[PDB]
């Protein structure tokens, strides 16, 4: 079939991840919301893309904003998007929040949701799902050891989300995001695998 | 279609043929190679580096007969990462270990002293990334991790304890999905593969991690009488394909 | 890209899911054969459709037709002989289609379809088991409720013997394999069938 | 146009050949084929199976005269299941048990013994789907549902209490909709019906429920006279067109 | 006329059915709607339905929000669509709700009305509003009994409707969805009935 | 897939309603036909409108004229001669065309629009039923107030008689059958009057 490839399978979207900001809450008391974005971070999602060694990326991005009541209020986010080299934002306030360099859309609640397209974020050709194997060129300690796995290539950026307000917001709002990959090419043998835990849904 | 009965393959003959050597074997598998691909040298397009790699062909791409280990009824299989065991001897391991970067296919011939009788087909592949994985604790909350031993085998190739241990985390049974020359070793025991490959990375330094590991892990058990020799030995010898480097430098082992 | 190619894929499929252990589905994957005088023997019997067995779910094929609802196509097992090269024995293996039940006799088996496997003439047989449907699809997982969902069953059997010269071992392996045709279709994805995640994330 | 006064149709003749069997009968009706179409053998697009299909035409295909009954004044009808009824009786029941999937078109000829006083004509009529019902206890409560035996009348084509009740909740005025060849039977009573048909169900194995259901039920009253005779058998004879199975396997009457 | 053909008749909306999902209400406290499409479930456009044996189908769905009041609150409801082989939603919350294949559309209340159009679902070439005969091979009990209707190929699946929030609603939200089929081929002799009670409007 | 072309169908409407049974329709369906040495008595009339009898209503053509509040088109309307061969007789069967009354004569009804039956010379007639209308199209459902609704009446009427030798039957039915003619058209379709649910559902 259709669904069968992988434009197909792939095309539904997924949720990559959801953050909150608390009104209230201490936590994302100050402005902050950042996310790396992964294109994992989703088990399932995961999975999949793990199924694949490698793969390019074009995506479309769906921002929805809801509560944990579902309800939603009226706030306008802007979120930008930064590159792995940048200094994020320090605080809501932080000025490199003002920045020229990150894109920069300006949405309300509602929204109806803002929909965004986003490139394939590499130096290299691609992204792996898997390295074996250190970026890093010095002596392999115990500690250091952690290290291996990192492809440092996929490492997709941040999205730093900004609130408009000095002050404390009065209400709660939680973000999920929806990614949907516009085309991808991906061609290599490269087994799923069940097995025993190393860790969730690892080979290794 | 194929010959239904030998893992094989080759009664007729495989002959590897590389600078300053020569290899030909009457018990040889014949080639398989990787994805339908043949090991090419970079193109211009392909090439950031704006070096003049070195070619030396033949020296470096020939016959190096690494290793043998004997087999017993059942072995743990080990694996044999490719750039450092090459990197070991030379010529070729020199220049790999002195220049920054290698990428290259290479020939594989796997032979074991020619028996009928062996059964218990090995599997012998390849996998470019192989990511290795420990138990963790076997809790899993251990969260543990590479030896940079391990990560450099060296020419031995180390072995890995258990069969899905090899790599990663991937069960005998699915391992098949990576294709493999199975030596039956019912029919003589010889695997020839060629792995051409287009490396996930566009470049690794594999002064490093391993741009290959290449596994052998016996599904069948050898089972055999009292009767006759408790012993083959399993030799694998393999040559590069032209390779490319960059990066002139001084020599580190890394 | 397909997952149909994967379906493809070589990877084995154990014959019968019998767990010596859970962690090792080697024990399971292969199947003794041994010198037996006696005539007709069962080497081995599975439901031919990879979600019932489980090891063929295990395998590439069953976990894609775990994913699929629907899966319509003419899947294929090979079986390899490990024993030694002295050895020699021939067997049966056969699909017994559906609206038949399992043979459970060599006569009846034999008639269904099925191939002569003779050893030493071939160490290996490839069967081969067809897409015989009322209906055009089929459902992946098959639950008491559905006759349509049920591909039918595999089973193996001794045709003649198996047989050594004494300084050769008695026992021997079979190694199963199984892959799809080239006409094979899926439908109908499902949440991941092949896999749960043992916990969701955030 | 048509003879205004027969039903019959056909003093003419109607002639059925069929393998290893022809009827001919004077008093028959001429042919209505179903909806404009003709039995035909499925497409190679049609067709999902991927088995050759087996098309013993003449065994097979040819005249059967499963029953007769005889007719009183008034008789409670009769509906016949199209797989069961043949499948009883070989060449065709004994392959169509056998295989799993049944499909065609048959040409049906219902015949009684010629009489012209007959009156009070019977619809004929086939029904694909025909999906039997009950009372549910009549408070409609029930909820009540189908026999097995029912479901599967084999030869027999067991009847159907009342006309309505014939398949299903179908007044016999509305019946009609579905087409019918009646006998009047005041002419000579026949009817011949060739009923190619598209099923509803892209296959139905038929080893279930059945593909069409072939019923007779009076309109009209017999009358006549002390005069003369009670009696009149009515027999069916069908042939079905060239049928497609699937599915070899062993033997099951299911 | 125009009116007298199928899609002209067919064409008119119809109101397949509404589900409720009660603030207050225990029932549906849980997040869960879930409804399996029925083509069916319309007394009239059962009939109608049943006039003709086979049909193909292709649809608009148009969602409408209401509440028993009439008056509508803004909920941003997100509701998926299953198909049967899948596992529901057990839950609000539950993991799957956040699925990558159940189509995923996001709207308020307002909406103004989300409309969507989607597929015929069969594995076969139609849909059979009735079947004689079960589904089932094996030996036919009484129990088993109550089994011949089903032919569920004319088994369309279900629409899953999510809320967003964690916690229960504050306001009450029912839906009513309404089909048109985008266009109708059907063609076969099939009488309509008009008759004694088995049932509804049944035939047998 | 057109409902006219359901209208068409041949399916029985009983000459006028009289309900024996409500749950039989059959009772009323078929109209007897006795010797009777009377001359002109009347077989049976109806309002030849399908709303206003209601066994026209029953009837596909019946059912779909309740369904459009408009309807114009000739309708057809066959009778059969269920009668035994050795019987005959001679029947007249009229419309009285709208502006008309049931002409409760033989006479008066006879002028209108007839056609003779002779049977034995035929046993089935095929009465025709014409549209004549004021207005281009009529409405449905026919109350007292809409004269422009009405389409008339149907009677059948003894021409000659009904004779068999004794040896046969007294007596015999007539079977009605009706049909819309090829141009029959529909327009102004209502909430389904042919059917209302006893019952919505949520």
Same mark, same amino acid.
């Given at each position: 079939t259709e669904e069968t490839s992988i434009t197909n399978f792939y095309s539904r979207?997924?949720?990559?991840?959801?953050?909150?900001?608390?009104? #209230?809450?201490? !936590?994302?008391?100050?402005?902050?919301?950042?996310?790396?974005?992964?294109?994992?971070?989703?088990? #399932?999602?995961?999975?999949?893309?793990?199924?694949?060694?490698?793969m390019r990326?074009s995506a479309?991005?769906?921002?929805?904003?809801?509560?944990?009541?579902?309800?939603?209020?009226?706030?306008?986010?802007?979120?930008?998007?930064?590159?792995?080299?940048?200094?994020?934002?320090?605080?809501?306030?932080?000025?490199?929040?003002?920045?020229?360099?990150?894109? !920069?859309?300006? !949405?309300?609640?509602?929204?109806?949701?803002?929909?965004?397209?986003?490139?394939?974020?590499?130096?290299?050709?691609?992204?792996?799902?898997?390295?074996?194997?250190?970026?890093?060129?010095?002596?392999?300690?115990?500690? #250091?050891?952690?290290?291996?796995?990192?492809?440092?290539?996929?490492?997709?950026?941040?999205?730093?989300?900004?609130?408009?307000?000095?002050?404390?917001?009065? #209400?709660?709002?939680?973000?999920?995001?929806?990614?949907r990959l516009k085309h991808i090419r991906a061609?290599?043998?490269?087994?799923?695998?069940?097995?025993?835990?190393?860790?969730?849904?690892?080979?290794? | 279609?194929?010959?239904?009965?030998?893992? +094989?393959?080759?009664?007729?003959?495989?002959?590897?043929?590389?600078?300053?050597?020569?290899?030909?074997?009457?018990?040889?598998?014949?080639?398989?190679?990787?994805?339908?691909?043949?090991?090419?040298?970079?193109?211009?397009?392909?090439?950031?580096?704006?070096?003049?790699?070195?070619?030396?062909?033949? =020296?470096?791409?020939?016959?190096?007969?690494?290793?043998?280990?004997?087999?017993?009824?059942?072995?743990?299989?080990?694996?044999?990462?490719?750039?450092?065991?090459?990197?070991?001897?030379?010529?070729?391991?020199?220049?790999?270990?002195?220049?920054?970067?290698?990428?290259?296919?290479?020939?594989?011939?796997?032979?074991?002293?020619?028996?009928?009788?062996?059964?218990?087909?090995?599997?012998?592949?390849?996998?470019?990334?192989?990511?290795? @994985?420990?138990?963790?604790?076997?809790?899993?909350?251990?969260?543990?991790?590479?030896?940079?031993?391990?990560?450099?085998? @060296?020419?031995?190739?180390?072995?890995?304890?258990?069969?899905?241990?090899?790599?990663?985390?991937?069960?005998?049974?699915?391992?098949?999905?990576?294709?493999?020359?199975?030596?039956?070793?019912?029919?003589?025991?010889?695997?020839?593969?060629?792995?051409?490959?287009?490396? =996930?990375?566009?470049?690794?330094?594999?002064?490093?991690?391993?741009?290959? +590991?290449?596994?052998?892990?016996?599904?069948?058990?050898?089972?055999?009488?009292?009767?006759?020799?408790?012993?083959?030995?399993?030799?694998?010898?393999?040559?590069?394909?032209? =390779?490319?480097?960059?990066?002139?430098?001084?020599?580190?082992?890394? | 890209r397909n997952l &149909?190619?994967?379906?493809?894929?070589?990877?084995?499929?154990?014959?019968?899911?019998?767990?010596?252990?859970?962690?090792?589905?080697?024990?399971?994957?292969?199947?003794?054969?041994?010198?037996?005088?006696?005539?007709?023997?069962?080497?081995?019997?599975?439901?031919?459709?990879?979600?019932?067995?489980?090891?063929?779910?295990?395998?590439?094929?069953?976990?894609?037709?775990?994913?699929?609802?629907?899966?319509?196509?003419?899947?294929?097992?090979?079986?390899?002989?490990? *024993?030694?090269?002295?050895?020699?024995?021939?067997?049966?293996?056969?699909?017994?289609?559906?609206?038949?039940?399992?043979?459970?006799?060599?006569?009846?088996?034999?008639? *269904?379809?099925?191939?002569?496997?003779?050893? *030493?003439?071939?160490?290996?047989?490839?069967?081969?088991?067809?897409?015989?449907?009322?209906?055009?699809?089929?459902?992946?997982?098959?639950?008491?409720?559905?006759?349509?969902?049920?591909?039918?069953?595999?089973?193996?059997?001794?045709?003649?013997?198996?047989?050594?010269?004494?300084?050769?071992?008695?026992?021997?392996?079979?190694?199963? &394999? *199984?892959?799809?045709?080239?006409?094979?279709?899926?439908?109908?994805?499902?949440?991941?069938?092949?896999?749960?995640?043992?916990?969701?994330?955030?």
């Open positions: 979207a997924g949720l990559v991840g959801v953050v909150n900001m608390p009104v #209230q809450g201490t !936590s994302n008391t100050k402005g902050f919301a950042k996310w790396g974005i992964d294109i994992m971070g989703f088990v #399932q999602m995961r999975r999949k893309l793990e199924l694949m060694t490698y990326f479309e991005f769906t921002f929805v904003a809801s509560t944990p009541e579902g309800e939603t209020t009226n706030l306008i986010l802007q979120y930008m998007y930064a590159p792995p080299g940048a200094p994020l934002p320090t605080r809501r306030d932080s000025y490199e929040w003002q920045t020229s360099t990150n894109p !920069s859309i300006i !949405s309300k609640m509602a929204d109806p949701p803002a929909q965004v397209s986003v490139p394939f974020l590499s130096p290299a050709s691609a992204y792996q799902w898997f390295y074996d194997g250190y970026p890093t060129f010095g002596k392999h300690p115990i500690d #250091q050891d952690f290290q291996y796995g990192m492809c440092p290539n996929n490492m997709m950026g941040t999205f730093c989300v900004r609130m408009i307000g000095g002050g404390k917001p009065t #209400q709660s709002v939680t973000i999920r995001i929806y990614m061609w290599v043998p490269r087994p799923l695998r069940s097995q025993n835990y190393t860790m969730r849904n690892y080979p290794n | 279609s194929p010959t239904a009965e030998a893992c +094989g393959y080759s009664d007729r003959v495989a002959q590897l043929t590389v600078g300053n050597s020569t290899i030909t074997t009457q018990e040889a598998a014949n080639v398989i190679v990787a994805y339908g691909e043949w090991p090419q040298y970079c193109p211009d397009t392909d090439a950031t580096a704006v070096d003049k790699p070195t070619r030396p062909d033949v =020296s470096v791409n020939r016959f190096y007969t690494l290793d043998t280990k004997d087999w017993s009824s059942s072995s743990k299989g080990w694996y044999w990462k490719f750039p450092d065991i090459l990197a070991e001897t030379g010529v070729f391991g020199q220049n790999a270990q002195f220049h920054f970067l290698y990428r290259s296919g290479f020939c594989i011939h796997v032979q074991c002293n020619a028996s009928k009788f062996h059964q218990g087909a090995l599997l012998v592949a390849v996998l470019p990334e192989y990511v290795t @994985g420990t138990v963790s604790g076997n809790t899993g909350h251990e969260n543990t991790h590479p030896p940079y031993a391990a990560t450099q085998p @060296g020419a031995t190739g180390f072995e890995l304890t258990n069969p899905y241990i090899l790599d990663a985390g991937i069960p005998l049974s699915q391992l098949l999905v990576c294709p493999h020359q199975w030596i039956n070793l019912r029919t003589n025991n010889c695997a020839t593969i060629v792995v051409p490959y287009i490396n =996930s990375v566009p470049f690794d330094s594999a002064l490093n991690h391993c741009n290959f +590991g290449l596994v052998v892990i016996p599904v069948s058990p050898l089972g055999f009488l009292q009767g006759a020799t408790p012993t083959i030995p399993i030799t694998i010898t393999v040559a590069p394909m032209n =390779s490319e480097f960059s990066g002139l430098r001084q020599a580190v082992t890394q | &149909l190619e994967l379906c493809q894929i070589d990877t084995i499929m154990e014959v019968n899911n019998l767990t010596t252990n859970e962690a090792t589905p080697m024990e399971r994957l292969r199947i003794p054969v041994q010198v037996q005088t006696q005539s007709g023997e069962l080497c081995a019997a599975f439901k031919a459709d990879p979600g019932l067995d489980g090891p063929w779910q295990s395998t590439m094929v069953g976990q894609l037709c775990r994913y699929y609802t629907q899966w319509s196509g003419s899947l294929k097992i090979t079986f390899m002989f490990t *024993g030694s090269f002295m050895a020699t024995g021939k067997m049966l293996i056969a699909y017994t289609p559906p609206g038949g039940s399992l043979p459970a006799n060599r006569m009846q088996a034999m008639l *269904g379809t099925h191939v002569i496997w003779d050893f *030493g003439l071939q160490s290996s047989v490839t069967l081969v088991v067809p897409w015989i449907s009322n209906t055009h699809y089929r459902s992946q997982a098959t639950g008491s409720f559905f006759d349509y969902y049920a591909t039918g069953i595999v089973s193996l059997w001794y045709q003649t013997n198996f047989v050594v010269p004494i300084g050769a071992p008695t026992t021997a392996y079979i190694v199963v &394999l *199984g892959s799809a045709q080239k006409n094979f279709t899926m439908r109908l994805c499902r949440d991941t069938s092949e896999l749960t995640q043992a916990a969701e994330y955030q």
